Amino acid sequence: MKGDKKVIQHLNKILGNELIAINQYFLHSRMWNDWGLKRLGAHEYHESIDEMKHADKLIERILFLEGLPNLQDLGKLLIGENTQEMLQCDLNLELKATKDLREAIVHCEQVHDYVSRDLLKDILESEEEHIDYLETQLGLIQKVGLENYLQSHMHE
Amino acid sequence: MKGDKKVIQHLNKILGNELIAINQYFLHSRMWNDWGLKRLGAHEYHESIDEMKHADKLIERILFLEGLPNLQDLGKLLIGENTQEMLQCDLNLELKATKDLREAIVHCEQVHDYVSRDLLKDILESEEEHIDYLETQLGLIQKVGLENYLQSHMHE
Amino acid sequence: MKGDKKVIQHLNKILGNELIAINQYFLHSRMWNDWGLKRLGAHEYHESIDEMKHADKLIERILFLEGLPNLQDLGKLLIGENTQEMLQCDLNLELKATKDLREAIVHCEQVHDYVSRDLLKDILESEEEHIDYLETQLGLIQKVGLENYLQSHMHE
Amino acid sequence: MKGDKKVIQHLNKILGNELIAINQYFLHSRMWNDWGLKRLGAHEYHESIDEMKHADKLIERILFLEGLPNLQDLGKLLIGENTQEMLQCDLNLELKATKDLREAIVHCEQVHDYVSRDLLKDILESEEEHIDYLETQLGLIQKVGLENYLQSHMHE
Amino acid sequence: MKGDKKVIQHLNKILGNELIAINQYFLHSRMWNDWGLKRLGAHEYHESIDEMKHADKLIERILFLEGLPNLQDLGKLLIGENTQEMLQCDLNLELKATKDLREAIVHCEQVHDYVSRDLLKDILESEEEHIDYLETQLGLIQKVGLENYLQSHMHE
Amino acid sequence: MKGDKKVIQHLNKILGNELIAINQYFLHSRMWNDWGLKRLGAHEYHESIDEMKHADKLIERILFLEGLPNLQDLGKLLIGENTQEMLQCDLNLELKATKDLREAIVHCEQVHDYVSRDLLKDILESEEEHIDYLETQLGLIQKVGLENYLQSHMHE
Amino acid sequence: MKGDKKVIQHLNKILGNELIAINQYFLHSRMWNDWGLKRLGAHEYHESIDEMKHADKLIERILFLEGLPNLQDLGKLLIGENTQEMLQCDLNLELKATKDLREAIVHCEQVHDYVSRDLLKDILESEEEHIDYLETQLGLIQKVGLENYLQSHMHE
Ligand code: HEM
Ligand code: HEM
Ligand code: HEM
Ligand code: HEM
Ligand SMILES: [K+]
Ligand SMILES: [K+]
């Protein structure tokens, strides 16, 4: 079904953000696992999987709309060097992701692509839930102290 | 455990090949699904998952050896425009992957990193299994005809 | 709960499209079954049942909004004479149906009938899935040949 | 129990034919699997297993009759280069085998070795069933065409 | 996948050793069963089956590497005339097999056919397990006496 | 089966290292249990058992190769007196152990004892898993602080 | 709980005896397994395990009493070269062990370490059970002859 060219451009932009997130979260997961912070590693692994599922749906939607999914262009991964930085890197990424999702939803609405809008809204709900998690972790580091926070994330 | 710097470079190079293949096979899978060739789409999805698992193991090995996994530098995806082309693109990628695997194994052997060698040998066994599958599909297209071959791959 | 009069008019227009689709898809189903193409016959039956469920929900919404559902005025059935024509007739109907659905959503949004919009978005998702199915069938006819395509739809 | 010398010679000749068939069918099975014709590959594997079981019983009978089973002399394997040739190679071998079985049964009857006769009759029944299969496959190649015939033997 | 021509020659040489062992061990098994030494007969049967499985894997590897498996050129079976000779004939055969396996692995390693090497290594582990069994049996014949050793192998 | 004399000397050297590790880990386990650090105690017990299993396989291999396993010449145990030193003592022992394993594998490869090499490779994989655990634990003490680290290991 | 210094020295002497017995019984077990005498191998393995469990209770008691368990000094292993010698070597060790256990119990009684006495009495009961087994095996060899005795210990 021939989709709107600019919708497909927006879907490829969102897809690009998801492809960054997949790799960034997966590396952060395996870094936390390497450091013995297995609760963080497991949670971050599930974040990466969730972004994979979003990327899948975007690819499927782009192809149904007769566009070409772009899995070639990979933007800048924000890789931290310690737990505080890694969480903030994920948070910085997610805030760019939600800006772009809101702009894509506007455009879907204007060309009456209400199904693509509904998909993007679902992805946006998932990204805001990730923001909630991240902001909460950063707040907990302040409330319990960094050593306690990390200790609490050693064991699953 | 401090690894050989050149081993780590080889492992990042293999990881780079797996990252290409993850994206190429995943896109090929969703294209075949979109065209109604669901048996191909499902098979190619499982190939993409297999590459994801190899990438995971490579990432974990690099970190254990105190290297920096490189998920940033994505190489060229070989995307076909029809089934015959897509299969040949996968095969071309696999032949490059196995050449690089052999060179990495040689080096691991020379520096006595026998555990990295064992990992890469397992990955090489998986890639040769993919080559077998790909060569066989191309052969079947010649034996049964393209139209029959595609017909046989419509339904799961 | 007294609804917007033009919303009710749009809902009755969507219902009119669903009532055409029920009969067209049911007759095509039974034609394919009579011809021994039982996989087409069964899939088309399920498409007709889906339209019946949509019509049900539209009738219920119209009555809740204190309008009069119009089940009396049946528009033109597009009945094919062979498989390719029947599929294209279904696709022509669906493209008209999605056009009307989008115009109805616009009007729901403008007068703040957000629940009617949500119902119509869900129906639109179902109709786009049928379009995907129909487009894929027509494409498969070109990839495997009509004779193979019909062969693959003889048996459930 | 001391058997007739010529009966034992016949049994060793039948054994020699089965030993050829084991290897021929096993190699054909693995050729078909390598080509992705897994249904032919699996069926031919079962034909090879059936010949293994006959060879076992012949070896046991020879040893009971105080003869020396000959597993050393292996006659000529008829290996085809395509599916039609492999099937005909199997058939030609089976037609020789049943001729030799009939001559061995004649001699068993003459010297009153009714138990060896019964064994050979059971083996002959298996070989005629294999002939039925082979002639049927070659007939189906003619009825449905080679491309369809091979298509129908891709998947188990 | 086109393999190294000398690798393929080594694989056919290993395959030829497996084919001798299949026949030698099967015949020894059935001789022991005929003599009422059913525990030896059963264990020897399972040795033959294991060699059949190795032969299968070699045939498959050879075909994947685009060589022609040789099931035609059967070398010399070493058939004993009593239990002590049969075991020693098996051991003599296994010691030649392991020599040939080691030389094949050397070459696989030199030309980087690491998957063929892995297969050969697995086969060599099975062959060394058989050597262990055979050497132990000959030691037991000394330690318990021939009469007791045979008595211990009458019943399963 | 007569083994290479120097291979057997390497195997006895690896055995000696496992024999040290069995006792060191078992004592460290029981010290941690006595101190109320039961999670360390249990994990360290499982490390000792794994070393026991490696020593068993080494003894079995040495005897098969017709060597004399040396369980008499116990080398120096590295017994720590607090948690951090105990972990570092285990790490120091493992680093010596993997150095010896690599030298033994080199020699196995040179004399073509590929089964001994495969055994030592499996043992090296286990010791590298232990190194990974140990390095992770020492890193955790730095990240969460010694008092929290110990706290987290009081309870199973 | 600070224990009597000479009690602790006795406990370490008993521990030393158990440590010799662990290795001596484990090697004898694996020697019998290598020779095909698996019932002897299995029983001697279970004797080695029993001594391992005694050593564990002695290590735990010494630590509780605030002594230092000595796992470093290994006394002389009495390794036999044939079954009779191996059993007698085990018996000679056990008789030295029970002599040392009796002197240890005398001293525990004198200084009122009744709990250590109870542990040593339990170990003494196990060692006297092992002496029973060993004396009985040596007696059976005399009654049934070594060849029959070994025959009866081939299969588990
Ligand atoms: C560095 C790149 C990637 C890595 C390391 C990775 C890793 C993984 C792993 C380990 C799994 C679990 C496999 C299993 O055990 O079953 C998985 C699942 C999955 N991946 Fe990826 N992946 C990557 C990229 C992608 C991309 C780019 C996509 C899609 C565009 C994707 C789509 C999926 C899906 C759909 C699943 C299954 C999720 C489910 O459980 O439903 N992955 N991935
Ligand atoms: C040509 C006109 C129609 C035909 C031939 C037809 C046929 C059928 C058939 C054969 C079934 C399955 C019943 C069963 O076996 O249990 C069914 C179910 C149903 N029909 Fe129709 N129908 C028609 C029109 C309609 C209309 C106009 C509506 C609503 C406005 C409707 C609503 C439904 C509903 C709600 C179901 C139950 C579906 C479910 O939940 O499984 N049908 N119809
Ligand atoms: C090229 C030579 C041969 C090959 C590749 C081969 C291969 C095989 C394989 C793969 C199996 C199934 C094993 C399993 O997974 O359980 C099998 C079974 C068997 N083979 Fe062979 N074989 C060969 C020769 C022989 C010969 C020469 C004999 C007898 C003289 C024989 C007797 C049997 C028997 C009795 C079975 C078990 C059948 C059953 O399931 O009852 N085979 N063979
Ligand atoms: C030559 C040195 C040793 C060898 C080869 C050895 C071997 C073994 C083996 C093979 C097992 C069974 C493991 C399994 O499959 O789960 C085991 C268990 C065990 N070992 Fe050792 N071991 C040795 C020394 C020791 C020592 C020195 C101690 C204590 C100081 C010890 C304490 C234990 C314990 C407590 C068990 C568990 C027994 C049970 O409850 O089942 N072992 N050993
Ligand atoms: K705390
Ligand atoms: K006896």
UniProtKB/Swiss-Prot annotation, chains A, B, C, D, E, F, G:
Further remark: The unstable catalytic diiron-binding site within each subunit (Fe1 and Fe2, ferroxidase center) also serves as a pore for iron uptake; the ferroxidase center is labile. In the iron-loaded BRF crystal structure additional stably-bound iron ions are seen inside close to the ferroxidase pore. Mutagenesis of residues reveals other stably bound Fe cations in the interior of the BFR shell; they may represent a pathway followed by Fe(3+) to the central iron storage core.
Organism of this sequence: Pseudomonas aeruginosa (strain ATCC 15692 / DSM 22644 / CIP 104116 / JCM 14847 / LMG 12228 / 1C / PRS 101 / PAO1)
Residue positions binding Fe(2+) Fe2: 51, 94, 127, 130
Principal location: cytoplasm
NCBIfam families: bfr
Record lineage: Bacteria, Pseudomonadati, Pseudomonadota, Gammaproteobacteria, Pseudomonadales
Residue sites binding Fe(2+) Fe1 per the record: 18, 51, 54, 127
Name by which UniProt lists this protein: Bacterioferritin BfrB
Catalytic activity: 4 Fe(2+) + O2 + 4 H(+) = 4 Fe(3+) + 2 H2O; Fe(2+)(in) = Fe(2+)(out)
Localization in the cell: Cytoplasm
Subunit structure, as described in the record: The bacterioferritin (BFR) complex is formed of 24 subunits (FtnA and BfrB) arranged as 12 homodimers. The holocomplex contains about 8.7% Fe and 8.0% phosphate. A pure BfrB BFR is a hollow shell with an external diameter of 118 Angstroms and an internal diameter of 73 Angstroms that binds 12 heme molecules and up to 600 Fe(3+) ions per subunit. The BfrB-only BFR has twenty-four ferroxidase pores which serve as a conduit for Fe(2+).
Binding site for heme b: 52
Pfam family, one: Ferritin
Cofactor comment text: Each BfrB homodimer binds 1 heme group coordinated by an axial ligand from each subunit.
Gene symbol of the encoding locus: bfrB
Biotechnology: Small molecules designed to bind BfrB at the Bfd binding site (derivatives of 4-aminoisoindoline-1,3-dione) cause cell death in model biofilms, and are bacteriostatic in planktonic cells, suggesting these compounds are potential antibiotics. Model biofilms were tested in strains PAO1, PA_1081725 and PA_1076058.
Enzyme class, first EC level, given as a word: oxidoreductase
Domain of life from the UniProt record: Bacteria
